[PDB]
Design a protein around this ligand. Sequence first.
Ligand SMILES: [Mg+2]
Ligand SMILES: [Mg+2]
Lengths: 270, 1097
Amino acid sequence: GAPCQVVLQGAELNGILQAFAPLRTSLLDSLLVMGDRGILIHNTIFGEQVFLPLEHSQFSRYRWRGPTAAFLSLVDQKRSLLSVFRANQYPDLRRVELAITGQAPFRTLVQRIWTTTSDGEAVELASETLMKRELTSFVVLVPQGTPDVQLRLTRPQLTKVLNATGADSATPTTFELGVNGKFSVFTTSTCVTFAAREEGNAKTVYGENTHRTFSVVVDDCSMRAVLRRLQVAGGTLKFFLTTPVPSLCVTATGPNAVSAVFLLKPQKIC
Amino acid sequence: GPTQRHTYYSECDEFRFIAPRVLDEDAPPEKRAGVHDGHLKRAPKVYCGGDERDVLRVGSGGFWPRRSRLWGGVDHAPAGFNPTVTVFHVYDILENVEHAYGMRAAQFHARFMDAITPTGTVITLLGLTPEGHRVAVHVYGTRQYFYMNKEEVDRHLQCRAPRDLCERMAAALRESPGASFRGISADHFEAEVVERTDVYYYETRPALFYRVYVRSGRVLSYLCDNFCPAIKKYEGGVDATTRFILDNPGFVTFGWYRLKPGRNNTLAQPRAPMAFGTSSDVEFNCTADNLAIEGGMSDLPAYKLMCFDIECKAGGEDELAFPVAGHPEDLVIQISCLLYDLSTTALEHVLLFSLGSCDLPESHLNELAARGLPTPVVLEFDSEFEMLLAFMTLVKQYGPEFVTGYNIINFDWPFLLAKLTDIYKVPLDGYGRMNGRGVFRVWDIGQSHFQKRSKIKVNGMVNIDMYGIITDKIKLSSYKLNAVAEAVLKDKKKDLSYRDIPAYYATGPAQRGVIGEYCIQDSLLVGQLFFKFLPHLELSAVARLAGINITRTIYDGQQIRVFTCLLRLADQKGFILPDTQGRFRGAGRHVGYQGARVLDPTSGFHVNPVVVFDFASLYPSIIQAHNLCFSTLSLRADAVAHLEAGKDYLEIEVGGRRLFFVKAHVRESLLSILLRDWLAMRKQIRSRIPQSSPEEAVLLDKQQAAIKVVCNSVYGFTGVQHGLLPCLHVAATVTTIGREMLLATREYVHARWAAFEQLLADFPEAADMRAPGPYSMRIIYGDTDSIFVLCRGLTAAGLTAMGDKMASHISRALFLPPIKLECEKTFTKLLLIAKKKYIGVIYGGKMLIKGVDLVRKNNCAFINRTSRALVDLLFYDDTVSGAAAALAERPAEEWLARPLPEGLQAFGAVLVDAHRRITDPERDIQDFVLTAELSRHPRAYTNKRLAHLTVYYKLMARRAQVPSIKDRIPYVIVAQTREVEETVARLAALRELDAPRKLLVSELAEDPAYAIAHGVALNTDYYFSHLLGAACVTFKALFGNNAKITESLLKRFIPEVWHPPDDVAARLRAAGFGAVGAGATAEETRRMLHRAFDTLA
DNA sequence: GAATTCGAGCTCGGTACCCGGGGATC
DNA sequence: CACAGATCCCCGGGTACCGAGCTCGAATTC
Ligand SMILES: [Mg+2]
Ligand SMILES: [Mg+2]
């Protein structure tokens, strides 16, 4: 095998077939950051930052040796290393291997696809093998730390919450969890509330560290656009309040595991 | 006084004083800017040293040399000056009209007055006796004439005698819409019935024609334009000079001559000095029977060359505006004027005309003395008129037979003549070799989509602009005199930009001396280029051969050379050439007929030997071999019915037309005789080269080269739609036979030598030549007159020799005797890129690059240098040539999916190196100067969105130096910043009212000088994308000629970077995040990465 | 209705043609 | 008022589909 290799056959390849399906074409043009922990798939949709982790756990064989290596997903500015996992682009596929060979700064990935031939082993699409050399300089900036509070929604709950905020600079949209645990979002026109329940009706949300109140507000409006452009089926909201620019990450719990990180206005707390 | 008036200033006492106000030493700071401009009542003065003189004074003493005898009606020769003239060189021929009433007092003999009695054309042979005396011989009996079909004019005009035709033409010249020909009789023509044949269409019969014998070309031009416009006049486009040359056998327009005793003992008779028509020492009048060609002498008699160069200053508010000759305040400040001897090539005088005091630097004067050059003579003037009058007085008194300079037809002479006509109103008609009424004109291309070039015609004065010469002989992106000096002479001169000339001019005499230093250096370099290329010798060789004077050789195109030679031959044979452009005289990519066809190349990288069989002089050999001409053609099969199918005539379908050309034993082609006679003549000369002196070897090289370029244009002369004697049947036949010849050669090679046994059977030495692999001899390319034969399984070592035996075999087998296939080259490697594009390495020889934009003038030095580095890797690095050859083992699309072969690592390295040399902020901007020719007047362009037109109109908007038509306009592609975006936006707003985004490359074009003076950044995107584009254009032959695969694979070499943008980078740094790139240190980046993922988990 | 389909409607490059123009090649 | 020819690739600028996405908008409906 390759010095660095990542294999997926079924019962781990079907798992990624669930992960990638809704994501659609956006994240085709991405950054894959591969290391010993897995592949982090970073993109920016409408400016706002998006990451899709796919951990070493989640493959049929993960072997990483070397520094971390970042490949621009697009090969030759037309084809993607991540279109192999588009919902139905290669029907009947069976295996995908990521082979990363070469020396620490200059490695190349080669992505080999295979199909289950009708009653057969492989059709290996040498007409669809992709070969990418790595970036050799990259600085990607990644969410840090644990959240200052986080709030699990089902899908309808989150579709409501997103549908409340406004996608234009004129409205700024505010998220506030006040005392007794009634978590709310609103603007000059819309408002929505839910009741927060701990972990350790249809208008309630389960979360951790709700006792940490907050009241944050959001500008530079892309958030509904993005969490629909990603097709998020409900997910956790998680708020990082500590920062000189506090951050909101909507992490899906869904068949995907995508996450979109947004920034907010500087907020006084404590 | 003189018989004919002298219209050059011999006296002046009042003139228009224009002079910069900064010159007046004592003046206050207020009265220093501007220009004194008013009329002054004194004679023009010239100051040399402490001395002073009237400009127009020809007493003894003078600040410049003189070769004149007369000066405004005073004979300034030593007493008894009466040199005997036998032999004289002739460098130019003028044709003037003289009248017997104008020359009553001139005391000519009766012969000459008879030749001019109302009127007559006098052919003035301008020359030099071997003692150096200037001389004019006036030849008197020549007449111009044309033919009309006798029956045609008889039935159209009811002409019962030749006297009736003469009367009728005289009548029609009386009754012209203007009064241009008043008092013109029927004794001004002389009709005679001759039997001649039209030159076309071999069935054509000899008919009776009137030949008319008019006395002036003005009268001829009128008659041929307006007299019986239905009737076909035959040669009324012919000069009196060409009748003088052709009607006297042996006469030349450029050569030595003799005064004979003539028939009935009539000798040439010298003019009295007052009857002189030219600024010449001695002056004869004769008839052609008094002249003999005087072979035996071949070398020039010490004509003088004047290499000159003006320097101009911009008055007005902006003196950083380029000078404009129309502005009285924008004035010529200096003129360097170098006087060489053309026989010994020795710089004799260095003159610097200066407006204001000028003290040449001592380093400059010491350099001139070190090189043995003459000491400069700085002439100082108070006003511009004094300077320009003094320069024009030099040009008249010295009277250089040749003048030269760099770009003197586009800038210098137009500026001087604009000043002398617009501003000072000096008549320039007598400032040439004639004392008056002479042409002193300059034609720019201007609005003429016909003209290829700007012309200058001074009578008796051969202007050879070295700008045109170097544009013909050397391929440069830029033809600036500094660039040309770097490229041709290896002399790195120092330039003086015009923007510096105001400041220098205002300091005082020393800095004007510095301006004079650059003006003299420019003239000295141009003299060096002139005596390197020796344009006069090859232009005179073509002039001798063509039968035209050297000025027409320089200026009036290719067509008149072939036409005159054809006219001589045709007249000898009893033909006459019809005027049909004379009727045309008031006249996406059109093509008259079908051209050559290029064989579909077997593109790719061929690392086997490739023999190149090419035809020696293909088209002219076809014209000779097949006897093509006007007079052998026959569109009708009726014409040849009395002749045999072969053995008397070829018949061929040329445009779906089924033409017939009779063979040389039925009628020998006139174009064939011209080409054959010249190719025999040239073989004679080229054989005499090796066993003659170096000095005569230089002339003979010029003479044979003249023959070469004269026998290349015969084909195209026939294919000039609306030319002087077109025949698209002959032109299309030549090309049809060429296409058939090329294909026939291919089929022969493929049928004969398909197997090695046949080759060995024809050529035994092939056995010593069999390389290891399997044999094949296949044709991978051919352009018009060559085939490339990929000889797999043979060694390149002995292959041009056997290829010569092969080519001889094919020529014997297939083609007729003047046709000659031959083998000259053998590529050991060849990259066939496209139909006219290839790079090869000749066996034991150079690298040959053909049309791949290494050899095109348009690209920048950066991209061309990188491209040649890559080409040298492909051809010379055995590693890369091995990997490039192994690249053809697979279809190209499998290299997208596979690593490239190993040896190509170096090929990538060049690219990545260029990728980092291009983003360097300290990038030499001259390496990024694209260039493009302004081929038309910019109002003649359909598509006025080119980069060089954007730069053109920017230059005009800034009052910079606007380029001339046919100049190269250099430009750079600037970086598309905020400011450039709005500049283009509001120039669009302003331009369309006169009468997020990516901007076009035409809108990012900028002038490089402007881009330097201002701190404008270059478009690294454009320049790198075009670096990769030129690489992909050339190396797509390696990847199966697929430019989309080639581009992908070439872009893969480039190291790709990804950071989030600067603004968010700063804002996250404020949010505490930090660099994990290479930018500070690798070790710190590693540590930050370790804590950044440990931070993540 | 709430998801939910592919249905219908936008736009947004992509690729390709077409043309003039530069500037080679014979 | 002056005038070799034609062929050919390639690039810049222009247009015109047109499939791919790509969300909205509203019949058919778990
Ligand atoms: Mg000059
Ligand atoms: Mg100059």
